[PDB]
Amino acid sequence: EYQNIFSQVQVRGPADLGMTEDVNLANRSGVGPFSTLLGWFGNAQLGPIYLGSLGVLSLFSGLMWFFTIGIWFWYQAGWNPAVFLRDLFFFSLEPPAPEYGLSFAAPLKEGGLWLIASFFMFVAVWSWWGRTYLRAQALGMGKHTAWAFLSAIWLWMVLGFIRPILMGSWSEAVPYGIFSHLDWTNNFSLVHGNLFYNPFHGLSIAFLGSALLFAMHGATILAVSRFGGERELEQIADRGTAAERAALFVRWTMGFNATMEGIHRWAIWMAVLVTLTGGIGILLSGTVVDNWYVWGQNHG
Amino acid sequence: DLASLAIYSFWIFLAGLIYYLQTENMREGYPLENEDGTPAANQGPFPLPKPKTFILPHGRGTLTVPGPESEDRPIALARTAVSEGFPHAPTGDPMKDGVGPASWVARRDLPELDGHGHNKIKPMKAAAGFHVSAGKNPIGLPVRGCDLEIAGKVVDIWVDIPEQMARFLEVELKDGSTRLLPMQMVKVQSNRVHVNALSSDLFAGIPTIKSPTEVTLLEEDKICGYVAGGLMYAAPKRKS
Amino acid sequence: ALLSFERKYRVPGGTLVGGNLFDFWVGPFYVGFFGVATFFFAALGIILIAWSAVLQGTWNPQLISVYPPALEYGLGGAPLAKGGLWQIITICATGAFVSWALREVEICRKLGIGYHIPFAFAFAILAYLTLVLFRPVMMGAWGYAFPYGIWTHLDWVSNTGYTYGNFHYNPAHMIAISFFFTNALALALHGALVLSAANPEKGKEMRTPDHEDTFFRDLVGYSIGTLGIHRLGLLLSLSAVFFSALCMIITGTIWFDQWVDWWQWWVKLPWWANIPGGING
Numbered sequence: 093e094y095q096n097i098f099s100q101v102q103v104r105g106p107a108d109l110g111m112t113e114d115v116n117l118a119n120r121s122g123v124g125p126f127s128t129l130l131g132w133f134g135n136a137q138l139g140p141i142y143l144g145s146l147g148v149l150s151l152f153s154g155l156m157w158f159f160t161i162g163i164w165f166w167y168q169a170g171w172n173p174a175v176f177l178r179d180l181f182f183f184s185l186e187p188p189a190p191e192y193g194l195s196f197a198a199p200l201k202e203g204g205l206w207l208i209a210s211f212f213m214f215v216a217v218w219s220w221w222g223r224t225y226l227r228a229q230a231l232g233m234g235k236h237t238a239w240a241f242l243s244a245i246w247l248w249m250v251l252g253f254i255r256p257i258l259m260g261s262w263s264e265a266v267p268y269g270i271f272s273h274l275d276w277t278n279n280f281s282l283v284h285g286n287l288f289y290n291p292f293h294g295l296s297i298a299f300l301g302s303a304l305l306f307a308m309h310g311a312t313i314l315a316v317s318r319f320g321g322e323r324e325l326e327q328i329a330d331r332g333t334a335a336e337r338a339a340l341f342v343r344w345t346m347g348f349n350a351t352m353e354g355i356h357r358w359a360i361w362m363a364v365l366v367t368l369t370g371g372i373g374i375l376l377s378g379t380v381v382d383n384w385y386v387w388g389q390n391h392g
Numbered sequence: 393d394l395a396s397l398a399i400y401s402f403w404i405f406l407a408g409l410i411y412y413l414q415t416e417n418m419r420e421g422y423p424l425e426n427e428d429g430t431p432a433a434n435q436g437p438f439p440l441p442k443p444k445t446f447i448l449p450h451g452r453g454t455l456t457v458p459g460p461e462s463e464d465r466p467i468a469l470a471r472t473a474v475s476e477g478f479p480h481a482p483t484g485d486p487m488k489d490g491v492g493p494a495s496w497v498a499r500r501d502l503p504e505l506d507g508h509g510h511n512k513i514k515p516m517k518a519a520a521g522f523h524v525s526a527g528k529n530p531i532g533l534p535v536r537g538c539d540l541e542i543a544g545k546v547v548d549i550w551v552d553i554p555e556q557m558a559r560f561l562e563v564e565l566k567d568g569s570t571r572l573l574p575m576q577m578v579k580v581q582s583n584r585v586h587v588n589a590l591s592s593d594l595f596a597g598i599p600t601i602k603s604p605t606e607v608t609l610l611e612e613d614k615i616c617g618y619v620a621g622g623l624m625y626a627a628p629k630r631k632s
Numbered sequence: 633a634l635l636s637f638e639r640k641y642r643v644p645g646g647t648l649v650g651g652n653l654f655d656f657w658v659g660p661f662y663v664g665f666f667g668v669a670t671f672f673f674a675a676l677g678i679i680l681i682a683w684s685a686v687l688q689g690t691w692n693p694q695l696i697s698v699y700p701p702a703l704e705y706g707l708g709g710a711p712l713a714k715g716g717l718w719q720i721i722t723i724c725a726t727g728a729f730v731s732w733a734l735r736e737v738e739i740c741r742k743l744g745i746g747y748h749i750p751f752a753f754a755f756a757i758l759a760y761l762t763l764v765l766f767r768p769v770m771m772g773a774w775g776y777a778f779p780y781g782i783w784t785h786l787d788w789v790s791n792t793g794y795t796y797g798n799f800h801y802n803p804a805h806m807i808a809i810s811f812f813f814t815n816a817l818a819l820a821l822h823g824a825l826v827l828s829a830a831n832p833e834k835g836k837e838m839r840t841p842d843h844e845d846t847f848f849r850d851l852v853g854y855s856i857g858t859l860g861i862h863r864l865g866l867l868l869s870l871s872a873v874f875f876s877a878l879c880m881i882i883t884g885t886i887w888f889d890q891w892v893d894w895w896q897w898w899v900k901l902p903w904w905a906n907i908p909g910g911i912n913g
């Protein structure tokens with residue numbers, strides 16, 4: 093039997109400049125190359141990418157945030173490339189010491205460089221949020237991507253912005269670094285008495301869930317690619333045999349059934365709920381509840 | 393306690409979500425039926441959703457779902473037992489009448505369109521500068537069935553103009569006519585295309601397309617179901 | 633209990649074993665042999681959990697916990713009182729999971745579709761047997777496996793993952809978390825993509841797959857395509873569980889010390905292990 097995890101044959105035509113609609117087109121670039129390497133898995137055409145006003149602001153700010161941390165890494169590395177490459181996972185840009193609190197003016201070598209990179213990160217992400225909205229609006233589509241993106245922003249915002257303000261200090265935030273933000277994730281669980289006893293942590297894991305649903309849905313459409321199941325919209329507006337067998341495999345296996353549009357309702361909600369409950373769990377941790385083992389002792 | 397209210401406010405919201413999601417998965421297939429086709433008594437706890445109605449692009453009318461569910465085709469089956477839940481044996485040739493693995497859906501007898509309104513699937517010989525960019529080119533290779541015999545040769549690739557990918561193989565049979573083979577049902581080898589699903593004598597039974605320049609939703613289902621059904625109903629002839 | 637389009641697909645045959653014997657449904661469910669075997673190992677299972685209360689203690693499900701045999705028992709047998717129940721329940725669990733997987737296969741044959749779905753299930757079962765079999769057998773005791781209790785298998789994780797310092801430093805744990813985070817990201821977008829096209833702005837027509845690719849290209853400069861995002865979905869998921877079994881079978885067998893110290897081989901490389909400055913040295 094043939095599977096369908098790689099393509100046997102590749103075809104290529106003129107570069108697809110894409111749908112037009114109310115897009116500006118002046119901000120679309122020259123089409124990139126066609127990589128045969130990607131063509132085996134998915135598509136092969138690179139670009140054209142749209143870069144508007146916000147597209148530059150974010151991309152600029154994102155390089156500004158990225159470079160700010162790496163400059164600090166070079167300082168710590170004694171401007172030595174060997175110490176840089178070796179200790180790379182170990183360098184870290186920590187927030188200001190708790191003595192400063194929420195004071196927006198701290199010395200650079202003692203946390204002031206943190207707030208500089210955070211401002212770039214704050215404007216880079218949000219200008220990218222607005223970018224995902226207007227790219228849907230320009231094609232006359234639902235904004236569902238910008239709405240699910242807010243859920244990721246939510247956890248991100250609670251981790252390094254809302255919770256620090258609620259706890260009255262910048263030091264409660266997350267440092268920029270590999271091995272450092274791993275230790276932060278650890279001690280947070282320990283300062284608050286095992287996050288396992290956080291009911292929102294438990295639900296966030298449960299929705300993470302997504303790996304189950306995305307394993308099933310991927311396998312199902314591949315299983316029915318012989319009937320053209322990958323064309324998922326024309327099967328919504330005109331159910332084929334591909335969508336019927338997919339529904340009945342779910343019916344005959346576990347019971348309740350799923351439609352073509354119905355299964356994607358599950359899909360987006362399984363993900364968005366990961367960071368939705370996760371942000372709530374972190375927001376209450378420390379601000380309202382000091383120890384989840386002690387909280388869980390009172391069963392709530 | 394504040395956190396206790398947050399966790400209870402959620403489980404209420406979650407139960408509403410499951411309700412919402414489980415109703416939206418009732419647009420197609422409901423209302424439930426019995427084996428004879430009459431509406432069933434127990435239709436599940438959840439009620440049918442509010443009809444939503446799609447606006448089809450390119451002036452192709454609308455689709456309101458949930459809507460009148462009918463086969464719009466005859467099913468050549470019959471009961472095997474006297475009570476519910478039992479299989480239904482075919483009253484004819486399951487591949488011709490189209491039941492079980494070989495079932496097909498009476499979709500619109502129009503072809504699918506790309507965003508610009510043109511046919512999504514065209515044969516490469518009519519495709520604006522479309523060519524094979526990687527892998528082996530199946531044009532010209534013979535087509536071998538599940539019985540190790542040669543049923544024809546590939547004479548074209550039907551490609552997906554917008555999504556840029558092969559979808560069918562136009563296979564010329566002995567009598568000169570061509571059939572379409574789903575690409576995910578053929579094995580393109582170094583020196584031949586091998587079809588594990590069908591044996592050589594069932595390629596003539598593949599449904600024929602009406603127009604040579606275009607293929608239909610309805611015609612696509614009749615072909616894929618036929619080839620996919622051959623996995624089960626070509627049992628007296630399948631070695632590798 | 634039929635769907636309005638379901639009669640044409642309920643034809644006999646496709647069974648792996650038994651033939652037309654168990655070829656039949658109960659309401660929406662297909663049975664087959666392996667539906668019987670599943671219900672067998674299942675029902676046999678719950679009997680033994682419910683048993684572990686006559687001798688274990690209370691009925692509260694938040695407190696029932698069938699722990700494995702002690703370490704002194706090795707891979708040898710143990711009395712049902714302390715560990716013996718665990719061992720048999722582990723068999724019924726496996727017997728029910730394998731029967732479930734083979735059951736979907738019979739369903740795949742009846743429908744003439746690919747076997748991709750039970751294959752993806754296999755990776756979950758692999759990770760399960762890693763934790764309750766291969767990881768202990770290789771270790772030499774069943775007491776190394778996790779117990780079957782609601783909040784007590786979390787206490788197993790918190791104690792196991794701390795025996796080696798902070799577990800975040802386990803390198804395959806690092807790779808495994810990545811796929812879980814990315815697959816979740818991949819779900820988020822793929823779910824929004826299809827819906828944003830089939831449910832566009834109010835009053836506008838259904839967007840095409842072209843409007844989906846055009847979205848991603850405008851946003852990031854590349855779109856994997858409809859068939860690609862599904863190939864991507866299966867891989868990110870199976871790879872997440874893959875390394876989530878790999879990161880376990882190496883832990884305590886080939887490496888039993890603190891996981892943070894494992895990373896010293898990179899820091900203690902000869903060309904830079906002695907240049908002062910920086911964090912390390």
Ligand code: BCL
Pocket residue numbers: 293294295297298299301304677678760763778782783785786789
């Ligand atoms: C590899 C990861 C670790 C581990 C660490 C964690 C962590 C960390 C968390 C859980 C959580 C859960 N774990 Mg555990 N858990 C492991 C192995 C298991 C196994 C198993 C046989 O392998 C099972 C059945 C469970 C079961 C469960 C649930 C009680 C809960 C939510 C799961 C979920 O959403 O899944 C995704 C699947 C779905 C959403 C689909 C629906 C599945 C339902 C929820 C399954 C219920 C099973 C029921 C309790 C079993 C009773 C047996 C009877 C015979 C029926 N764990 C291993 C050892 N588990 C979370 C929790 O809330 O704990 C209190 C949590 O925070």
Ligand code: BCL
Pocket residue numbers: 217244245247248276277278280281286287288292293296297300366367369370371373374789813816
């Ligand atoms: C020892 C450590 C502790 C612990 C402490 C914590 C802490 C602390 C946290 C978690 C969190 C999480 N934990 Mg826990 N947790 C433990 C045990 C576990 C176990 C387990 C037993 O195996 C599991 C599976 C989990 C699972 C999880 C996740 C479900 C959850 C994060 C959701 C998510 O998607 O984040 C990934 C998604 C994000 C971080 C959102 C990111 C959004 C932004 C916008 C992304 C872009 C940023 C930037 C611009 C990108 C630049 C791009 C460039 C191209 C590079 N925990 C133990 C008990 N856990 C979090 C949570 O929500 O808890 C409730 C959290 O804060």
Ligand code: BCL
Pocket residue numbers: 277729756757758759760762763788789790791792793794798799800805808809872873875876877878879880
């Ligand atoms: C303090 C605790 C330690 C820790 C210690 C551990 C330990 C200990 C383990 C993990 C494991 C995992 N950890 Mg860790 N880990 C921590 C921090 C984290 C964080 C975080 C941000 O804090 C994250 C995201 C993770 C992430 C993860 C994953 C890589 C992995 C679990 C998923 C998996 O594939 O399971 C695999 C999935 C299964 C085994 C499920 C199998 C299900 C079977 C096949 C079917 C059951 C069906 C059931 C009966 C159905 C009931 C249905 C009925 C109808 C009711 N860890 C901290 C540092 N981590 C686990 C691992 O490596 O697993 C390989 C593991 O054992």
Ligand SMILES: CC[C@H]1c2cc3[nH]c4c(c3C)C(=O)[C@H](C(=O)OC)c4c3nc(cc4[nH]c(cc(n2)[C@@H]1C)c(C(C)=O)c4C)[C@@H](C)[C@@H]3CCC(=O)OC/C=C(\C)CCC[C@H](C)CCC[C@H](C)CCCC(C)C
Pocket residue numbers: 301303304305307308311345346670673674677678721724725728729732736749750752753755756779780781782785869870873
């Ligand atoms: C690629 C791997 C990912 C994945 C995929 C996946 N799961 C799958 C499939 C796929 C592709 C299926 O087709 C199959 C299915 O039918 O899904 C609807 C399944 C499935 N994944 C399930 C659950 C599940 N998936 C999980 C995770 C994941 N699933 C992975 C991330 C988890 C977690 C996070 O641990 C769980 C709990 C089920 C809903 C279902 C398989 C159901 C099944 O096997 O049923 C047969 C068994 C019974 C009916 C009952 C048996 C009872 C036992 C004898 C009781 C005693 C033993 C048991 C271990 C007790 C203790 C547990 C303790 C924590 C209490």
Ligand SMILES: COC(C)(C)C/C=C/C(C)=C/C=C/C(C)=C/C=C/C(C)=C/C=C\C=C(C)\C=C\C=C(/C)CC/C=C(\C)CCC=C(C)C
Pocket residue numbers: 158159161162163165166206207209210211213214248249251252253266267268269270273
């Ligand atoms: C070698 O080449 C050079 C050096 C030039 C470039 C290289 C750079 C390098 C090596 C960069 C390395 C970067 C690293 C290691 C980044 C790691 C980041 C991680 C792991 C981050 C993890 C978590 C971060 C979180 C949760 C951040 C939260 C914060 C926010 C979402 C917003 C922040 C808010 C701020 C700062 C408030 C600002 C206030 C106002 C009023 C604007």
Ligand SMILES: CCCCCCCCCCCC[N+](C)(C)[O-]
Pocket residue numbers: 098099100129130132133
């Ligand atoms: C991880 C995503 C990147 C795509 C992977 C590309 C490698 C696949 C190569 C396909 C091999 C060619 N062939 C004939 C075996 O299909």
Ligand SMILES: CCCCCCCCCCCC[N+](C)(C)[O-]
Pocket residue numbers: 121122123124125138139140141852853854
């Ligand atoms: C042509 C070399 C420049 C490539 C820019 C880096 C990749 C950006 C993402 C893919 C877009 C490629 N493109 C179309 C901008 O050239």
Ligand SMILES: CCCCCCCCCCCC[N+](C)(C)[O-]
Pocket residue numbers: 290291292294295298391392399
């Ligand atoms: C979709 C099902 C999600 C799995 C549910 C996980 C249950 C854990 C919830 C935390 C327990 C809350 N409470 C009140 C019992 O403490």
Ligand SMILES: [Cl-]
Pocket residue numbers: 870871874
């Ligand atoms: Cl793999």
Ligand SMILES: [Fe+3]
Pocket residue numbers: 309313324822826
């Ligand atoms: Fe899909």
